[PDB]
Amino acid sequence: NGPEIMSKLAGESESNLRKAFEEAEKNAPAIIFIDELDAIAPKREKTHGEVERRIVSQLLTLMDGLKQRAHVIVMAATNRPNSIDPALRRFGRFDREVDIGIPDATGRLEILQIHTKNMKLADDVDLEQVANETHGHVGADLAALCSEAALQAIRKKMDLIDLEDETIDAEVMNSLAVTMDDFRWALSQSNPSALRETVVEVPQVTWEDIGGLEDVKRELQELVQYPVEHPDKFLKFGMTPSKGVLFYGPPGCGKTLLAKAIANECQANFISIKGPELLTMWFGESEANVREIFDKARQAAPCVLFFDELDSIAKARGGNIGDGGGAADRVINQILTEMDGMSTKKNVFIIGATNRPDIIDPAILRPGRLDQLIYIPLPDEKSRVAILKANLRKSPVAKDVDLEFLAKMTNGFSGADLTEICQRACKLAIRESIESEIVPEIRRDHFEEAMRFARRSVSDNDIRKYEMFAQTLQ
Amino acid sequence: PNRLIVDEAINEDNSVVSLSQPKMDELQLFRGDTVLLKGKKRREAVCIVLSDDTCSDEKIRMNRVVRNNLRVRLGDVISIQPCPDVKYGKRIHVLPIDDTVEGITGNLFEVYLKPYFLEAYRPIRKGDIFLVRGGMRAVEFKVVETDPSPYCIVAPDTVIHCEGEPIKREDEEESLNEVGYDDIGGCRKQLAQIKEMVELPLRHPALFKAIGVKPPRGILLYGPPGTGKTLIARAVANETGAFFFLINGPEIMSKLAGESESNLRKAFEEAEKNAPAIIFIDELDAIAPKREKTHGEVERRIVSQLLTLMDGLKQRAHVIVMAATNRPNSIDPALRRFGRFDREVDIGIPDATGRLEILQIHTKNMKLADDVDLEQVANETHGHVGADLAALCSEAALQAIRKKMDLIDLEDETIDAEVMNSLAVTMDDFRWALSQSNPSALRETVVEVPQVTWEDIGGLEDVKRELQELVQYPVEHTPSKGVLFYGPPGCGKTLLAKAIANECQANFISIKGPELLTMWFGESEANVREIFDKARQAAPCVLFFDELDSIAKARGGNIGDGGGAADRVINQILTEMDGMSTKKNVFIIGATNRPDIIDPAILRPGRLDQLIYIPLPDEKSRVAILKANLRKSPVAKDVDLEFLAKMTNGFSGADLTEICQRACKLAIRESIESEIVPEIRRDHFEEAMRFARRSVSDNDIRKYEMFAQTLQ
Amino acid sequence: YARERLGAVYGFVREALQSDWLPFELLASGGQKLSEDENLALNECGLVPSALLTFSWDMAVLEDIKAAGAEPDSILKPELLSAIEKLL
Ligand SMILES: Nc1ncnc2c1ncn2[C@@H]1O[C@H](COP(=O)(O)OP(=O)(O)O)[C@@H](O)[C@H]1O
Ligand SMILES: Nc1ncnc2c1ncn2[C@@H]1O[C@H](COP(=O)(O)OP(=O)(O)O)[C@@H](O)[C@H]1O
Ligand SMILES: Nc1ncnc2c1ncn2[C@@H]1O[C@H](COP(=O)(O)OP(=O)(O)O)[C@@H](O)[C@H]1O
Numbered sequence A: 001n002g003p004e005i006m007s008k009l010a011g012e013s014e015s016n017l018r019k020a021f022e023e024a025e026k027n028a029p030a031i032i033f034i035d036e037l038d039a040i041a042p043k044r045e046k047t048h049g050e051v052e053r054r055i056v057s058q059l060l061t062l063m064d065g066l067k068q069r070a071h072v073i074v075m076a077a078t079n080r081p082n083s084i085d086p087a088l089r090r091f092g093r094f095d096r097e098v099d100i101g102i103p104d105a106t107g108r109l110e111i112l113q114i115h116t117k118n119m120k121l122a123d124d125v126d127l128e129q130v131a132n133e134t135h136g137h138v139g140a141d142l143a144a145l146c147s148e149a150a151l152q153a154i155r156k157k158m159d160l161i162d163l164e165d166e167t168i169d170a171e172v173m174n175s176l177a178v179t180m181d182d183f184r185w186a187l188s189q190s191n192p193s194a195l196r197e198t199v200v201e202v203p204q205v206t207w208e209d210i211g212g213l214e215d216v217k218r219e220l221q222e223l224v225q226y227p228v229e230h231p232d233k234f235l236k237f238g239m240t241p242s243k244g245v246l247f248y249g250p251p252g253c254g255k256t257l258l259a260k261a262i263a264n265e266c267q268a269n270f271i272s273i274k275g276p277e278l279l280t281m282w283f284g285e286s287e288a289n290v291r292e293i294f295d296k297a298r299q300a301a302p303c304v305l306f307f308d309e310l311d312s313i314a315k316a317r318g319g320n321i322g323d324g325g326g327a328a329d330r331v332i333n334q335i336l337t338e339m340d341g342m343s344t345k346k347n348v349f350i351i352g353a354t355n356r357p358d359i360i361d362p363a364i365l366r367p368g369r370l371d372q373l374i375y376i377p378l379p380d381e382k383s384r385v386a387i388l389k390a391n392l393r394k395s396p397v398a399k400d401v402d403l404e405f406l407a408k409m410t411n412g413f414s415g416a417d418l419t420e421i422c423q424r425a426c427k428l429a430i431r432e433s434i435e436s437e438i439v440p441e442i443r444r445d446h447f448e449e450a451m452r453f454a455r456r457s458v459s460d461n462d463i464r465k466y467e468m469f470a471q472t473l474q
Numbered sequence B: 001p002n003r004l005i006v007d008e009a010i011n012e013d014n015s016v017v018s019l020s021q022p023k024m025d026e027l028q029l030f031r032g033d034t035v036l037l038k039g040k041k042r043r044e045a046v047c048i049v050l051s052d053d054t055c056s057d058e059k060i061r062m063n064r065v066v067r068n069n070l071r072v073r074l075g076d077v078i079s080i081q082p083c084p085d086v087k088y089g090k091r092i093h094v095l096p097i098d099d100t101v102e103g104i105t106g107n108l109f110e111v112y113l114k115p116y117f118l119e120a121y122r123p124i125r126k127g128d129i130f131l132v133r134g135g136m137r138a139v140e141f142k143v144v145e146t147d148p149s150p151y152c153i154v155a156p157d158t159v160i161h162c163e164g165e166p167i168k169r170e171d172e173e174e175s176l177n178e179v180g181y182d183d184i185g186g187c188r189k190q191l192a193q194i195k196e197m198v199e200l201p202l203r204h205p206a207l208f209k210a211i212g213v214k215p216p217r218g219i220l221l222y223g224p225p226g227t228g229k230t231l232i233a234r235a236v237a238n239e240t241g242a243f244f245f246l247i248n249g250p251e252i253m254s255k256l257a258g259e260s261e262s263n264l265r266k267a268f269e270e271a272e273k274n275a276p277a278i279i280f281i282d283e284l285d286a287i288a289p290k291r292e293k294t295h296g297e298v299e300r301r302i303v304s305q306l307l308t309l310m311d312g313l314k315q316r317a318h319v320i321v322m323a324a325t326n327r328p329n330s331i332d333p334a335l336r337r338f339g340r341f342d343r344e345v346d347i348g349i350p351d352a353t354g355r356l357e358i359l360q361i362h363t364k365n366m367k368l369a370d371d372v373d374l375e376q377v378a379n380e381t382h383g384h385v386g387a388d389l390a391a392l393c394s395e396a397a398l399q400a401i402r403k404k405m406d407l408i409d410l411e412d413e414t415i416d417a418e419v420m421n422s423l424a425v426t427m428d429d430f431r432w433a434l435s436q437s438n439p440s441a442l443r444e445t446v447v448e449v450p451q452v453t454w455e456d457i458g459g460l461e462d463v464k465r466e467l468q469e470l471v472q473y474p475v476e477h478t479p480s481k482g483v484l485f486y487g488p489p490g491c492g493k494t495l496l497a498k499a500i501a502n503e504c505q506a507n508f509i510s511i512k513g514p515e516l517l518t519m520w521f522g523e524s525e526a527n528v529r530e531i532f533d534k535a536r537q538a539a540p541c542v543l544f545f546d547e548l549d550s551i552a553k554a555r556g557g558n559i560g561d562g563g564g565a566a567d568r569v570i571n572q573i574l575t576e577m578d579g580m581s582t583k584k585n586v587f588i589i590g591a592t593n594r595p596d597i598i599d600p601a602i603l604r605p606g607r608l609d610q611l612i613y614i615p616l617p618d619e620k621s622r623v624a625i626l627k628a629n630l631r632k633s634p635v636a637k638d639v640d641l642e643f644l645a646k647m648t649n650g651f652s653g654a655d656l657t658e659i660c661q662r663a664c665k666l667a668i669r670e671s672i673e674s675e676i677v678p679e680i681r682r683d684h685f686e687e688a689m690r691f692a693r694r695s696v697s698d699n700d701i702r703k704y705e706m707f708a709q710t711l712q
Numbered sequence C: 001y002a003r004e005r006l007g008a009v010y011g012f013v014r015e016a017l018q019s020d021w022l023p024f025e026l027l028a029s030g031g032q033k034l035s036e037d038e039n040l041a042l043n044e045c046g047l048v049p050s051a052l053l054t055f056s057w058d059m060a061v062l063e064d065i066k067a068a069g070a071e072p073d074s075i076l077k078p079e080l081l082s083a084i085e086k087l088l
Helices: A002-006 A012-026 A050-067 A105-114 A127-133 A139-160 A170-174 A180-189 A214-224 A231-236 A255-265 A275-283 A289-300 A312-316 A330-340 A381-394 A403-409 A415-435 A444-450 A460-472 B021-027 B064-070 B108-117 B188-203 B229-240 B249-253 B259-273 B297-314 B352-362 B374-380 B386-408 B417-421 B427-436 B461-476 B493-504 B513-521 B527-537 B550-554 B568-577 B619-629 B641-647 B653-675 B682-688 B698-711 C006-016 C059-067
Strands: A030-034 A072-076 A244-248 A269-273 A303-307 A348-354 A372-375 B003-007 B016-019 B034-038 B044-051 B059-061 B077-082 B091-096 B123-125 B129-134 B137-146 B151-153 B159-161 B218-222 B243-248 B277-282 B319-325 B343-346 B482-486 B507-511 B541-545 B586-592 B610-613 C024-027 C054-057
Touching: A002 A012, A002 A050, A002 B297, A012 A030, A012 A050, A012 A072, A050 A072, A050 B297, A105 A127, A105 A139, A127 A180, A139 A180, A214 A255, A214 A372, A244 A460, A255 A269, A255 A303, A255 A348, A269 A289, A275 A289, A275 A312, A275 A330, A275 B568, A289 A303, A289 A330, A289 A348, A381 A403, A381 A415, A415 A444, B016 B021, B021 B044, B021 B077, B034 B064, B044 B064, B044 B123, B064 B129, B108 B129, B108 B137, B108 B159, B108 B417, B123 B137, B188 B218, B188 B229, B188 B319, B188 B343, B218 B229, B229 B243, B229 B277, B229 B319, B243 B249, B243 B259, B249 B259, B249 B297, B259 B277, B259 B297, B259 B319, B297 B319, B343 B527, B352 B374, B352 B386, B374 B427, B386 B427, B461 B493, B461 B610, B482 B493, B482 B698, B493 B507, B493 B541, B493 B586, B507 B527, B513 B550, B513 B568, B527 B541, B527 B568, B527 B586, B550 B568, B610 B698, B619 B641, B619 B653, B653 B682, C006 C024, C054 C059
Parallel strands: A030 A072, A244 A348, A244 A372, A269 A303, A303 A348, B003 B059, B016 B044, B091 B159, B218 B319, B218 B343, B243 B277, B277 B319, B482 B586, B482 B610, B507 B541, B541 B586
Antiparallel strands: B003 B077, B016 B059, B034 B044, B034 B077, B091 B137, B123 B151, B129 B137, C024 C054
């Protein structure tokens, strides 16, 4: 590990590093694992000390020595692939790398199941519910939750039976079950160690989760699946598959679900990039992080790389006012370069979204980039009904609920607003159900009460702006 | 049964404990009855029981003096056994503890024991230790003989005797002058956070030896110097009993290579041997500065050694490491990775209430004159931290000492208790010390609960209800976490944000144009993250971003340079907002006078979803504004505030205030000139009306109304 | 009553004392002396729902009692003491 080697005096750090390699050869086959690689071998151009430059050189030559040390493989761990001296990643040495990242929603459930192999769980325990609540948690945190839940069950039962001793009867241990209250308690005690880092996962959104937009669903399949399901027809007709599509229109209409739903059917990873990430890169003069984003897509492939708030760069340049120039800038220039150098053979498809398409740098719409434009308006009468029904699939709906009437009244409501209505009515029905024991379906009174709080998020003038733009494009 | 958990006292008196009334009803004892408390090691103490509205049903509130006599600590359990058979005493022999009677002489009975017991009827048991404060000294006494046994109540007819050498403190007895929880004034919330994280693994270590899950390994306390970072760490160690090891940057850095790292790791080894223990590392930025900022071998190697020592805490069971820094961004980021120092607490600067409590703590032993008002002092000591209030009290004492010592004329090794007992610090001595004292935290941002309440804002009755609904709804029943205000200037935009913070008892963080501009101009917009971190640490708080368009105007506003509506700072603000949950108890309020050119991003769903228009006040509101502005002054009955409101049709709230202040200024002139009248007369308002004008034209109101109609 | 005045407590004690005419003071559990002629309610002085008072004779009569060599060995009237109950 980096910090232990660095804690040594000059000459001791180099000797200890060499010994580890010599021992691996004597015990070959062997694996040498170097933790905190960025601490043992930080970028030489980012340090000042002679000892640190010496240690980097010592590690670099030891890595090359692996051509003679038979059957010795060196593995290393860092937090960021670009926090280590670039020489380590040159041909030879560390010529392979794997992005572990953060466990996804399925992985979090898998981790909870792994760390409960020996635990007897009560019928009320739902580890999938826990995995969905544990956003930002990593395996170290999920393991803590399982052990803490086990201890709570032990203290409730065993401390009324046994003494403070080393040995417990097998019958008492097997008679102990861990309840959902013990897992929820542990959840309140734990705090996610990785809440801000981007999490890349295969989404669980399917086409049945999106109300309306039937033609957009088909269009995405033509853009994303056809180039690889029927490649012989694209070659036959000399067609160049599109590398991405840009969505525009009012917020809350399903732009995110569209990108996830196509990633879901394709079994591809979904990468969520938000405006603040593109904005930080520009202002901090760290546009090199654009390569990190596209490299994540290359390593996560097959994947769908989703760029939200694509207008954020144009807005940073002034948006409505700005100077007398164009939208071209440092960050978009790196984005365009990485897109042009990306091959369709890596099974990476790029989807963008904007709420201000009129200020998008026209360069992104040229062939080879996000050349395809899809308008996503507010749902119409038949789509709003479909949205309401889709959200209510998880809860029985009373015969007195007129969902078509609500759709005809909520003319200015977006899909995001229709969801709040359904979810609020569900909560109200649940509240009554719980109180009845201190009900089997959502009653009209629950929807009418929900309508007292629900509001439209998109104003009339915002709608006209989007419709006029869509009309301008003909 | 009949046993409660020991908690902190509210009544500082040493002879009384407080129970929740339902437990007094179960034990069938009355307010003022004498009871025995059964503690650990077959020890007991006798005290009087009262009740209050704050004690938990299952807890007993007792102070440090009572806990030490029982050899118990916070979180333990004791039995309560009423003893109505206690009789009045005939003779009690009390002797001081030598550790506190050094440098002081004279008749200790007349100064300390006599007024302490006189008509107090305090229960006393043989072997008790109790503290009497006065004469700028804290003197504790031990009871060595009681004619009745083993306890009694002192009476006016009880003989109080005190003859013999001071008693040497026993090794099992703790000094009552050691820092504890009762020595910490403000920052009670921060102390509560430390309790949740630290007290459990130290009081009950057996809960963590049985499991593979470790408690937090390090806590980083940051804030200006003199705020109590070390005081909290010591108070927690002393109250729980954990061994306290003191480390600081200069002590380690002053050593040579090899010896330096040896001393650092040796301290960690000692903590393990003495576990449970707390290791407090002061000036963390000095022992572990950012490595990329130094080229010395000693600094880089010490950081690496500290990093490995923190990781070794998984083996050093029950050792918790706490560190103090000025700012979380002044230390090597490696320390703040998962584990190590992954918990942060902002101590901040005490507000007016906290400063008063700190002054009351420092004056525990001080005799104050009847004219002394520490609340007035706390209000004047803006920008001061506890270290400065400690110096303030000491300097006020020294001035009082000089004034009387010139008359006492006692030149010897010790000072008589009587001449110190007659010494009192007056307001002239505090005000003198205030003029000489200089706050150490004057330039740092001060965050506190504002004093502006709803009664200070005229009109806007519906906006007041809207803000109360936005804050109350997510607590009583995705709720919005912010609102933008727009409209003419001088109508109360800022006051609304303060008033909602006031009523909620929430901290108000004011971000003004000049601060937004400074961050943009100096390319230091990263400071926005620190602003939001302050809002989170200050929760509950209202984070008010005024003049959101100040940068857009600085860049041309109606003309424009290289930018437009968005800038470095607003985009960093958007970055942080998108990561903030409605459960963080932070309510973000913005204000702008030019909503037509504000980055539309801020109003997109999930951000500043609420939007409230603040027009010019109507006629009945203008009257309310005048009444609010004049609520602090005498006003003659001839002043017709409704007539003034009828004339000032186009005036904003700020413009009505100018009229009130102009009339006040004239009242001051007349009062001074006449003395060389006692109320503001109509003549003063009529003169003010000759100069006051509306600041917002009719064309500007149309601009605001058009926007309001566009968004609805 | 929780709202009863302090003057009714002094009247109650006077009736119980062997000598109902002999001036005395009642000290509350908080260290505040209760004045017989003060129009203050029990729920305002902190003697509700229950409280113990400390009884002491007036200083003027204590000086005469001590100077005369009289031991104040009886406070209550025999008419109440003949019915005294023990606590367990
Ligand atoms: N067409 C739709 N069908 C079903 N739900 C929708 C639809 N459009 C929006 N929603 C709901 O609104 C929420 C926000 O959608 P999203 O596309 O993330 O909005 P945006 O990305 O514009 O903020 C989603 O969680 C979804 O439940
Ligand atoms: N919040 C506080 N409450 C009470 N006293 C305080 C507080 N902050 C500082 N003090 C006082 O100021 C002094 C702090 O000095 P020191 O022990 O060096 O601690 P630090 O410099 O870490 O604040 C002590 O006398 C302490 O009583
Ligand atoms: N609604 C109001 N009621 C009472 N006084 C007001 C009102 N609006 C403005 N004022 C006066 O104007 C002054 C400035 O108000 P402030 O809220 O700071 O304006 P802004 O928010 O435009 O900076 C205050 O000192 C106050 O006396």
